[PDB]
């Protein structure tokens, strides 16, 4: 009903804008490709000490030093 | 699918049906004034439904076979007995008046249901709003007692405030001498006994309590007899009446829905006319009551529910 | 023909009648099947 | 902590007493109910802060939400009482004795 | 402490202004002067009589909306969560519920003042 | 159909000719109850007959208004209703009767 | 009410007790109680007359005060034990406060005065809701803490409720007030066995509901809100007299009818627990209820009071009100004693 939508735009633009922004707020998170990083950054932020684990030889993937190649990497955030 | 919240949700809205001539028009006047002819012509010309004045047999004619029933079933009252002995001792006067008010309330419920369901207006001769003139004339002439008047007022207070008033009221003013002359000309052996004081009391009530009150909320049209004749003029007045008054303006779909639900259950409509106020004029007594009730339930087409009487031709009972 | 206002229950609600009869038949069939299956399971569990 | 909680308990008890003993105004009783709510909210907040039970901090806010809803309903009833009688005196509200 | 000090200083400054205002000017008191004001004619009734409120419904709606603000205010900390999907769903649902309540009142004519 | 009358509070009628005929006929019918020599009866019958003949002759609303010389057709309808009500009031006032009472000797003498 | 409002208020009414019954957190149980309290008031004050407003205000003030006391108990328990649930180590005074506040919400004597008035002031269907559905949420909390309740407090409340209901019902010519006092008596019985066997409390609740709902439906059939009004049943709707008589006698507790089983089994369990004196007093004073039910039976079914002339117009009309539920519930409430072992 483009005629009705139009009359609404002419007489009551405020409500038309309100509903348009409502819809855009609902939609944009789904469409956007950056929505994945919103939670990844929050996970990356370290608010608590990373307690080390006791080595036992069955831990080939968890690094031993902060500057080791292994472990999670934040270069994706460094160049976002 | 009886009307209900489900039907209202799925459609069947009153405001949708209402049109220009979806009104309630009430014709009033003293005895023998032309109400019947005026109402019939107004209804025929405007397309509305005519409702002949509710009488002692309105309920019986509207329910069951449609035939009138014995007076023991239809109220144990008699207009002829009222006119012959107005100051009886069995309270025929007040019994008749209360029965007539109950019949008028039932007819008003029927009319409102018709209007709300179909949107077609209704033309009624007198109504529960103007019924009290006869009671006031009775009390003024001494035919009834203050207790009877109090009981009538209580039932009216319990029942009347629940329904919308008529859109338009049309009062045919004819003076008492002409009322008397018309009664004599008609020649009813019992009606002719009416005293002129009783008619004057009816006119006094109509002109003192009714018209000023109804002017507050409805559209009132007062005519003399020479204008009541030629009903086309009355219809021409109604056709240009502008309704900008009364409780009909503040109604909406979800007020018409509840009014319709009230008016659709005739049992609920008459619930309060039967309050247990033990007025001797109206109290029956267990023995006579049970006798009459059993005799009534033994009438054809009354033993069971309407769709379940094999004696009157009802069929498929075992699957209903 | 008799009632001025045609009775509200002039004819059977055929949908209601059919559904009620079908529901009763289904209830009985399911009940018998359940009883037979329960007896079989009970005997199998208890070794006849 | 202990003295504070004792004082809060006594304040709630005083508000409950003010609620139980009427004084011819419905608004004053509604205000006493609000005072009881306030005391309970302070008690819960103090307990959560003292325990460092951060996961129980939602509950104080829910208390306020529901107390506010109750207060709104009470004020609507006050509006109805004033419409019916002209004042909020509880003396009038006695039709149901019979 | 730095806050109690400044608040107390502001209170004391206001109180000193009040004290000067009341104990400096020359005062001449009589009933005609001290009587209430009303455009030069004596009031016909007390000001304590009931004063009808035509926006009572909007006031009791404002209470609920204020509690809605209470619920919405923790959002700055909420957005710092790893469950951003849940936080967004909850925020959107809450705001839409508030909008639906406002719209229902609007349509039913609750935002209109009583006459 | 006129979108508006120029006058606030006066709605536009969709049946001007029918309404005017109704009101003029009612005025004539009520005047039939006046005494024959009533000058009000005579003059009002003259005026109403002339206006009713104009309404009968003219179908177009604009030219009907031009003929009636009464502004808008809605104003003419209003004046017809006023005339009918005035006739009803006069039928009770009975002003055709002889002067109710003469003035004192010099009640209207000016300069005194 | 329009459909949106009806849906949104009935859902809240239904949700309150559901949230209370399903919640593990005392605060969410309190939230359910608040849901019920807030959602029911509009339906009480729906008709908008001075009596409706008075009943709504009384209900609101009483129930809000009770909810605040319950929340006090919850918060003190949280302070004591660092948990949102009553434990075996919860303080006796905290549990007593909770019991007293929930008994105030229910309407158990001496916290019973509000109940008959609020019942009188509201339409019949609202009274049905109030006396049936609204009792589930407060009772669920008690049934969750039945190992913690004080037998002395509960038995004092129970016997007081029995006595006050029995004596109140005697003096009433109003059917809604009689229903309220019947509610008080049956709630006294329900609470008497809570510390010992809450399964019997649930059984008594179920039988009470299955008896009360049909009684209110029968009352609504003709809006019989008085003994004189109900006496005209022999003329207005004769067919219901037998079922009304049987339902009233079952509420009273005559053996052959189902309403006996709650009292019988509760007396059995109380005696098993050695509660002879209280059981005897309760069973003895539960006969005033039979008396003021038999008075109703005399007025309605075993005699014929005077009728009105206008009731013939009533007789003329056709009626469609009694649901399929009335017959089911009435038969289940009267003729189910033979199946007693299944119920327990
Ligand atoms: C122990 C713990 C476990 C729990 C187990 C459960 C225990 C039992 C809980 C307590 C039981 C009490 C329950 C009370 C239920 C309702 C009581 C009430 O107020 O209604 C009386 C009600 C009166 O109905 P009615 O006489 O047909 O009213 C005429 C209607 O207006 C006819 O017209 P209408 O269309 O307006 O009808 C009303 C309408 C209205 O619908 C609504 O308002 C709600 C939904 C609206 C949606 C839009 O409903 C609809 O039609 C659907 C709308 C679509 O009687 C009942 O049906 C109650 C049945 C008894 C249940 C007891 C079961 C105990 C077991
Ligand atoms: C027992 C408590 C008695 C309380 C007193 C009730 C009473 O006085 O009734 C009204 C009585 C006044 O009688 P009425 O004015 O002549 O009209 C009442 C009839 O409904 C007039 O209506 P009707 O003649 O059209 O219908 C009469 C109805 C006959 O229906 C009845 O009125 C009698 C129903 C009670 C039968 C009691 C069976 C005793 C069980 C022994 C254990 O149908 C029959 O004639 C035969 C149907 C087969 C018998 C119906 C049994 C079905 C329900 C069974 C439930 C059993 C619960 C125990 O007073
Ligand atoms: C313990 C005593 C509590 C205080 C008693 C106050 C006087 C009284 O009789 O209590 C009733 C009072 C209602 O006051 P009112 O209805 O106006 O009648 C006054 C009659 N002298 O009730 C009230 O005014 C509310 C009293 C609340 C007291 C809270 C603080 C008590 C401190 C001790
Ligand atoms: N006591 C009493 N008598 C009534 C009442 N309503 C009607 N009547 C009587 O019933 C008769 C009705 O008179 P009518 O005027 O002819 O009624 P109508 O035929 O429908 O209308 P009209 O054409 O004017 O005559 C009168 O004897 C009177 C009433 O409410 N109370």
Tell me if D24 CB under 6 Å of ligand 3: yes
Is G286:G162 a contact under the CB 8 Å cutoff? yes
Q: In CATH, what class is D2-98?
A: mainly alpha
Name the nearest CA neighbour of C1 among G317, B311, G316, B50: B311
- How does strand B168-173 pair with strand B122-125? unpaired
Query: What is the resolution of the experimental data for this entry, in Å?
Result: 3.2
Q: Is B144 helix (H, G, I), strand (E, B) or coil?
A: coil
Please tell us whether the domain made up of E2-115 is placed in CATH 1.20.58.1610.
yes
Name the nearest CA neighbour of G311 among B111, B65, B292, B79: B292
Residues in chain B closer than 8 A to F22 (CB atoms): 236, 240
Is D63:D40 a contact under the CB 8 Å cutoff? yes
Tokens of A80: 């976002």
Question: Rounded CA gap, G155 and G188, in Å?
Answer: 9
Q: How far is the CA of B32 from the centre of ligand 4 (A)?
A: 7
Question: Rounded CA gap, E74 and C27, in Å?
Answer: 55
Atom of ligand 1 nearest to the CA of G21: 2
Name the nearest CA neighbour of G79 among D72, E34, D12, B170: D12
Name the nearest CA neighbour of B173 among B214, B207, B137: B207
Q: Which residues line ligand 1 (CB under 6 A)?
A: B 4-6; G 3, 6-7, 10, 125, 128-129, 132-133, 136, 209-210, 213, 217, 321, 323, 325
Q: Do E82 and A29 touch (CB under 8 A)?
A: no
Query: Interior CA angle at G331 toward G327 and G336, to 5°?
Result: 160
Tokens of D85: 């009688």
The Cβ of residue C10 has, within 10 Å, a number of other Cβ atoms equal to 13
Interface test with B, best of F17, F27, F29 (most B CBs within 10 A): F29
Which phi-psi region, left, alpha or beta, contains residue E57 (left: φ > 0; alpha: ψ -120 to 50)? Answer: alpha
- In chain E, what are the domain boundaries? 2-115
Residues 6+ apart with CB under 8 A from B173: B29, B222, B223, B224, B225
Question: Rounded CA gap, G190 and E34, in Å?
Answer: 68
DSSP percent split of chain B into helix, strand, coil, nearest 5: 60, 10, 35
Is B274:G310 a contact under the CB 8 Å cutoff? yes
Question: Rounded CA gap, B54 and B57, in Å?
Answer: 8
Residues in chain G closer than 8 A to D29 (CB atoms): 61
Is G334:G258 a contact under the CB 8 Å cutoff? yes
The angle that helices E56-72 and E84-108 make with each other, rounded to 10 degrees, is: 170
Q: How far is the CA of G111 from the centre of ligand 3 (A)?
A: 21
G32 touches chain D (CB under 8 A): no
DSSP state of D23: -
Is B225:B33 a contact under the CB 8 Å cutoff? yes
By a Cβ cutoff of 8 Å, what residues of chain E touch chain D? Answer: 50, 56, 60, 63-64, 66-67, 70-71
Size of interface B-C (CB pairs under 8 A): 40
D67 touches chain E (CB under 8 A): no
Question: Rounded CA gap, E73 and A33, in Å?
Answer: 28
- How does strand B122-125 pair with strand B24-29? parallel
Q: Which residues pair with B173 in a beta bridge?
A: B224
Tell me if G237 CB under 6 Å of ligand 2: no
Q: Which residues pair with B221 in a beta bridge?
A: B170
Question: Rounded CA gap, G269 and F23, in Å?
Answer: 91
Tell me if D13 CB under 6 Å of ligand 3: no
DSSP E strands, G82-219 = none
Whether there are 3 or more C-beta pairs closer than 8 Å between F and A is no
Question: Rounded CA gap, B34 and B52, in Å?
Answer: 12
Size of interface B-G (CB pairs under 8 A): 103
Tell me if G172 CB under 6 Å of ligand 2: no
| Full residue range of the structural domain in which residue G312 is found | 2-344
Q: Do B305 and G236 touch (CB under 8 A)?
A: no
DSSP percent split of chain F into helix, strand, coil, nearest 5: 55, 0, 45
Q: How far is the CA of B98 from the centre of ligand 4 (A)?
A: 15
- Block residue for tokens 């409509």: B269
How many structural domains comprise chain G? 1
The structure's method of determination equals: cryo-EM
Distance of CA F107 to the CA centre of its chain: 33
Q: Which residues pair with B170 in a beta bridge?
A: B27, B221
Alpha-helical regions (H) of chain E: 2-23, 31-34, 56-72, 75-78, 84-108
Is G213:G132 a contact under the CB 8 Å cutoff? yes
Tokens of F70: 């009464």
Q: Is G114 helix (H, G, I), strand (E, B) or coil?
A: helix
């Amino acid at each position: 009903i483009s005629a009705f939508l139009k009359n609404a735009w002419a007489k009551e633009p405020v409500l038309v804008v309100s509903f348009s922004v409502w819809g855009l707020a609902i939609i944009m998170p789904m469409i956007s490709p950056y929505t994945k990083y919103a939670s990844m950054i929050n996970k990356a932020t370290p608010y608590n000490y990373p307690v080390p684990v006791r080595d036992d030889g069955n831990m080939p993937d968890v690094p031993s030093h902060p500057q080791d190649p292994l472990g999670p990497s934040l270069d994706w955030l460094k160049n976002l | 699918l009886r009307y209900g919240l489900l039907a209202a949700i799925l459609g069947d809205k009153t405001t949708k049906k209402l049109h220009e001539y979806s009104r309630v028009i009430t014709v009033d006047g003293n005895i023998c004034s032309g109400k019947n002819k005026l109402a019939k012509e107004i209804a025929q010309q405007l397309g509305m439904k005519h409702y002949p004045e509710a009488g002692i047999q309105y309920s019986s004619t509207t329910t069951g076979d449609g035939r009138p029933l014995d007076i023991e079933f239809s109220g144990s009252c008699s207009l002829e007995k009222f006119y012959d002995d107005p100051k009886s001792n069995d309270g025929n006067s007040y019994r008749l008046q209360s029965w007539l008010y109950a019949s008028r309330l039932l007819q008003y419920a029927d009319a409102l249901e018709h209007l709300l369901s179909t949107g077609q207006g209704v033309v009624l001769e007198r109504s529960i709003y103007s019924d009290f003139v006869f009671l006031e004339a009775m009390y003024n002439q001494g035919y009834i007692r203050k207790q009877c008047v109090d009981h009538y007022n209580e039932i009216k207070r319990l029942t009347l405030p629940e329904y919308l008033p008529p859109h338009a009221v049309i009062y045919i003013d004819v003076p008492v001498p002409e009322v008397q002359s018309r009664i004599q000309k008609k020649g009813d052996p019992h009606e002719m006994k009416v005293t002129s004081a009783y008619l004057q009391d009816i006119e006094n009530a109509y002109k003192k309590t009714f018209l000023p009150k109804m002017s507050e909320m409805c559209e009132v049209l007062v005519y003399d007899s020479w204008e009541a004749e030629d009903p086309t003029k009355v219809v021409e007045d109604i056709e240009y009446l502008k309704y900008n008054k009364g409780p009909w303006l503040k109604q909406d779909d979800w007020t018409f829905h509840y009014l319709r639900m009230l008016v659709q259950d005739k049992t609920e409509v008459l619930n309060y006319t039967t309050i247990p106020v033990y007025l001797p004029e109206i109290t029956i007594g267990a023995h006579q009551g049970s006798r009459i009730y059993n005799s009534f339930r033994e009438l054809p087409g009354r033993k069971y529910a309407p769709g379940y009487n094999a004696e009157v031709g009802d069929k498929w009972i075992w699957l209903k | 023909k008799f009632y001025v206002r045609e009775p509200v229950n002039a004819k059977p609600n055929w949908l209601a009648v059919g559904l009620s009869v079908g529901a009763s038949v289904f209830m009985w069939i399911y009940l018998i099947q359940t009883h037979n299956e329960d007896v079989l399971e009970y005997k199998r569990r208890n070794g006849l | 902590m202990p003295s504070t909680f004792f004082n809060l308990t006594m304040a709630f008890s005083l508000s409950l007493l003010g609620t139980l003993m009427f004084r011819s105004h419905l608004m004053s009783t509604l205000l006493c109910l609000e005072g009881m709510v306030l005391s309970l909210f302070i008690m819960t907040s103090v307990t959560s802060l003292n325990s460092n039970s951060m996961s129980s901090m939602p509950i104080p806010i829910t208390i306020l939400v529901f107390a506010a809803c109750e207060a709104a309903v009470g004020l609507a009833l006050l509006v109805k009482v004033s419409n019916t009688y002209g004042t909020d005196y509880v003396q009038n509200l006695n039709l149901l004795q019979c | 402490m730095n806050l109690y000090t400044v608040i107390f200083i502001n209170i004391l400054l206001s109180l000193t202004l009040i004290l000067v205002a009341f104990w400096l000017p020359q005062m001449n008191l009589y009933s005609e002067k001290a009587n209430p004001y009303e455009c030069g004619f004596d009031p016909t009734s007390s000001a304590r009589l009931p004063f009808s409120m035509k926006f009572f419904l909007v006031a009791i709606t404002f209470l609920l909306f204020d509690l809605e603000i209470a619920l919405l205010l923790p959002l700055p900390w909420a957005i710092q969560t790893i469950k951003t999907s849940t936080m967004m769903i909850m925020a959107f649902i809450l705001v839409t519920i508030l909008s639906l309540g406002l719209a229902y009142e609007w349509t039913q004519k609750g935002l209109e003042w009583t006459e | 159909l006129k979108k508006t009358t120029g006058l606030v509070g006066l709605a536009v009628c969709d049946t001007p000719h029918e309404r005017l005929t109704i009101l003029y006929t009612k005025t004539l019918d009520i005047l039939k109850h006046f005494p024959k020599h009533a000058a009000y009866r005579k003059y009002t019958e003259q005026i109403t007959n002339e206006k009713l003949d104009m309404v009968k002759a003219e179908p177009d609303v604009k030219k009907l208004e031009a003929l009636l010389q009464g502004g808008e057709v809605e104003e003419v309808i209003l004046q017809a209703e006023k005339e009918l009500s005035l006739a009803r009031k006069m039928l009770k006032w009975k002003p055709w009767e002889p002067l109710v009472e003469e003035p004192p000797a010099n009640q209207w003498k000016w300069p005194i | 009410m329009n459909p949106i409002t009806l849906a949104i208020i009935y859902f809240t009414i239904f949700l309150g007790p559901v949230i209370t019954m399903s919640s593990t957190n005392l605060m969410l149980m309190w939230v359910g109680l608040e849901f019920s309290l807030l959602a029911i008031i509009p339906m009480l004050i729906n008709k908008k007359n001075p009596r409706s407003t008075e009943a709504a205000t009384k209900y609101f003030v009483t129930q809000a005060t009770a909810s605040m006391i319950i929340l006090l108990a919850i918060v003190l328990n949280y302070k004591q034990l660092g948990t949102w649930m009553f434990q075996q180590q919860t303080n006796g005074l905290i549990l007593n406060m909770t019991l007293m506040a929930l008994s105030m919400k229910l309407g158990l004597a001496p916290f019973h005065f509000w109940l008959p008035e609020v019942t009188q002031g509201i339409p019949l269907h609202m009274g049905l809701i109030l006396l049936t559905w609204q009792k589930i949420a407060p009772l669920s909390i008690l049934i969750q803490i039945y190992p913690l309740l004080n037998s002395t407090i509960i038995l004092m409340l129970a016997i007081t409720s029995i006595f006050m209901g029995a004596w109140g019902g005697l003096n009433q010519t109003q059917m809604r007030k009689i229903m309220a006092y019947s509610s008080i008596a049956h709630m006294g019985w329900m609470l008497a066995i809570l510390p010992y066997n809450p399964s019997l409390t649930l059984l008594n609740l179920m039988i009470y509901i299955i008896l009360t709902a049909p009684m209110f439906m029968a009352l609504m059939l003709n809006n019989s809100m008085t003994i004189n009004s109900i006496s005209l049943l022999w003329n207005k709707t004769p067919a219901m007299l037998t079922m009304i008589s049987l339902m009233l006698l079952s509420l009273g507790g005559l053996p052959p009818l189902t309403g006996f089983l709650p009292k019988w089994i509760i007396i059995t369990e109380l005696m098993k627990n050695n509660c002879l004196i209280m059981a005897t007093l309760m069973a003895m004073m539960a006969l005033l209820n039979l008396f003021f039910y038999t008075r109703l039976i005399y007025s309605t079914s075993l005699t014929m009071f005077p009728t009105n002339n206008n009731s013939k117009m009533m007789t003329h009309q056709t009626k469609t009100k009694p649901n399929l539920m009335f017959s089911t519930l009435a038969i289940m409430s009267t003729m189910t004693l033979p199946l007693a072992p299944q119920l327990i």
